[PDB]
Scaffold this active site. Structure first.
Site, PDB file in Angstrom:
ATOM      1  N   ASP A  25      -1.410   5.417  -5.334  1.00 11.96           N
ATOM      2  CA  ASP A  25      -1.822   4.486  -4.269  1.00 11.96           C
ATOM      3  C   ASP A  25      -2.097   3.059  -4.775  1.00 11.96           C
ATOM      4  OD1 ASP A  25      -2.674   3.187  -1.963  1.00 11.96           O
ATOM      5  OD2 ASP A  25      -4.522   4.342  -1.732  1.00 11.96           O
TER       6      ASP A  25
ATOM      7  N   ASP B 233       0.808  -1.214   0.000  1.00 10.69           N
ATOM      8  CA  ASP B 233       0.000   0.000   0.000  1.00 10.69           C
ATOM      9  C   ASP B 233       0.852   1.280   0.000  1.00 10.69           C
ATOM     10  OD1 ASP B 233      -1.669   2.230   1.366  1.00 10.69           O
ATOM     11  OD2 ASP B 233      -3.164   0.681   0.833  1.00 10.69           O
TER      12      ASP B 233
HETATM   13  O1  LIG Z   1      -7.999   4.014   2.094  1.00  5.59           O
HETATM   14  C1  LIG Z   1      -7.923   2.795   2.209  1.00  5.59           C
HETATM   15  N1  LIG Z   1      -8.844   1.932   2.796  1.00  5.59           N
HETATM   16  C2  LIG Z   1      -8.292   0.659   2.879  1.00  5.59           C
HETATM   17  C3  LIG Z   1      -8.866  -0.477   3.396  1.00  5.59           C
HETATM   18  C4  LIG Z   1      -8.130  -1.638   3.359  1.00  5.59           C
HETATM   19  C5  LIG Z   1      -6.852  -1.642   2.847  1.00  5.59           C
HETATM   20  C6  LIG Z   1      -6.296  -0.483   2.339  1.00  5.59           C
HETATM   21  C7  LIG Z   1      -7.027   0.668   2.373  1.00  5.59           C
HETATM   22  C8  LIG Z   1      -6.647   2.035   1.921  1.00  5.59           C
HETATM   23  C9  LIG Z   1      -5.548   2.609   2.779  1.00  5.59           C
HETATM   24  C10 LIG Z   1      -4.693   3.451   1.858  1.00  5.59           C
HETATM   25  N2  LIG Z   1      -4.848   2.794   0.541  1.00  5.59           N
HETATM   26  C11 LIG Z   1      -6.201   2.155   0.479  1.00  5.59           C
END
Ligand SMILES: O=C1Nc2ccccc2[C@]12CCNC2
Ligand SMILES: [Zn+2]
EC number: 3.4.23.46
Length: 394
Positions: free
Chosen positions: A224, A34
């Site tokens: 991202d 991430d």
């Molecule tokens: O905003 C989000 N919600 C979520 C939920 C699970 C995993 C990853 C995420 C992110 C964190 C930053 N990148 C995507």
């Protein structure tokens, strides 16, 4: 870097993960890669969506920091307890690091059923780490403790009872030339918090959206890997959908399709790719007044999903969606390209990916330079709240 090729896996739309070990003896976990966050956090108790979880008590090298942490997102939130332990990436550099780890004790709409990951590796900067920027992120610790160069690169490769498997590579500490073709173009990192960039122009099939360019970056634009879609600010999203609708108009889809809530299908192998336009994002160049464009195909922004009902058909989800927190260049964008996170030189590189999905008429592209006279500043300045203002930074 051959040991690191193909070190990512996942299911289409549910995130790309790398295998890691934590603790002594090593506990194996699959960790979401991430670039939109800065914490290393792992499931550390039972949960209906987890096959397994980190057991702190079973590691001889665990140290408790006696500090809790809370991380909410627009979508999903988690909490837990901070510690440090020994961390390795088996299909990564041959080193072990002592890193901060958040042991997740409670979550909501964070873990994803069937995704096969149990934690999250936040690769962005200390400024957005929780609870604050004194919690050193994993990559920072890896670089400080070992010889590894301060850079990583990502090649995310896009795809009846289960979703499609996806693969990719996270190259830690350099760039693998087998993973791209042609030129590598760089855009400056605007500020080291997110991997924030500046978009200066947007075209849909060669046609300029003609918005004030600050709209493209309102209130930020970021790269991202942990976000599936290309997410666009409301005004930009509306303009873009209006244009894709016009290009594709020989076919009439449900509202739900354009909202990302419904699949559309064609007879196996008959998808009319050529009615859907390419989308070009022009990014700020390293040189003032220069830009370069990254161009993605419908094969990126239409996500394949096999319908158990009509598994005879090719079906797709629209994977561009509205944002109220700026542009997110998620996996839709990234699956076109080999992306270099050159932290050492405060820049992000894009080249055409050797694995991107395309056809015999069109490819994803990375092209420049394009030059402007007297560029407006396309960056937005986020209103400073009294909360954020009152923070000291020692
Ligand atoms: O905003 C989000 N919600 C979520 C939920 C699970 C995993 C990853 C995420 C992110 C964190 C930053 N990148 C995507
Ligand atoms: Zn102070």
């Amino acid at each position: 870097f051959v040991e690191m090729v193909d070190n990512l896996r996942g299911k289409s739309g549910q995130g790309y993960y790398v295998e890691m070990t934590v603790g002594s003896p090593p506990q194996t976990l699959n960790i979401l890669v991430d670039t939109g966050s800065s914490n290393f956090a792992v499931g550390a108790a039972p949960h209906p969506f987890l096959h397994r979880y980190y057991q702190r008590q079973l590691s001889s090298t665990y140290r408790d920091l006696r500090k809790g942490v809370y991380v909410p997102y627009t979508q999903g939130k988690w909490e837990g307890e901070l510690g440090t332990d020994l961390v390795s990436i088996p299909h990564g550099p041959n080193v072990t690091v002592r890193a901060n780890i958040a042991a997740i004790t409670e979550s909501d709409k964070f873990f994803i059923n069937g995704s096969n990951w149990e934690g999250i590796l936040g690769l962005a900067y200390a400024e957005i780490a929780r609870p604050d920027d004194s919690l050193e992120p994993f990559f920072d610790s890896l670089v400080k403790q070992t010889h590894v160069p301060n850079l990583f690169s990502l090649q995310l490769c896009g795809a009846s009872e289960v979703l499609a498997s996806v693969g990719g590579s996270m190259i830690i500490g350099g760039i693998d030339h087998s993973l791209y073709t042609g030129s590598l173009w760089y855009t400056p990192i605007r500020r080291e918090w997110y991997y924030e960039v500046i978009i200066v122009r947007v075209e849909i099939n060669g046609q300029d959206l003609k918005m004030d360019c600050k709209e493209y970056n309102y209130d930020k634009s970021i790269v991202d890997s942990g976000t599936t879609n290309l997410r666009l600010p409301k005004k930009v999203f509306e303009a873009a959908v209006k244009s894709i609708k016009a290009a594709s108009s020989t076919e009439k889809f449900p509202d739900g399709f354009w909202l990302g809530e419904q699949l559309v299908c064609w007879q196996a192998g008959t998808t009319p790719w050529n009615i859907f336009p390419v989308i070009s994002l022009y990014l700020m160049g390293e040189v003032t007044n220069q830009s370069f464009r990254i161009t993605i195909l419908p094969q990126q922004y239409l996500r394949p999903v096999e319908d158990v009902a009509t598994s005879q058909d090719d079906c797709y989800k629209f994977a561009i969606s509205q944002s109220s927190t700026g542009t997110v260049m998620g996996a839709v964008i990234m699956e076109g390209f080999y992306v270099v996170f050159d932290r050492a030189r405060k820049r992000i590189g894009f080249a055409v990916s050797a694995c991107h999905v395309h056809d015999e008429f069109r490819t994803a592209a990375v092209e420049g330079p394009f030059v402007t006279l007297d560029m407006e500043d396309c960056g937005y300045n986020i209103p400073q709240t009294d909360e954020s203002r009152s923070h000291h930074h020692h």
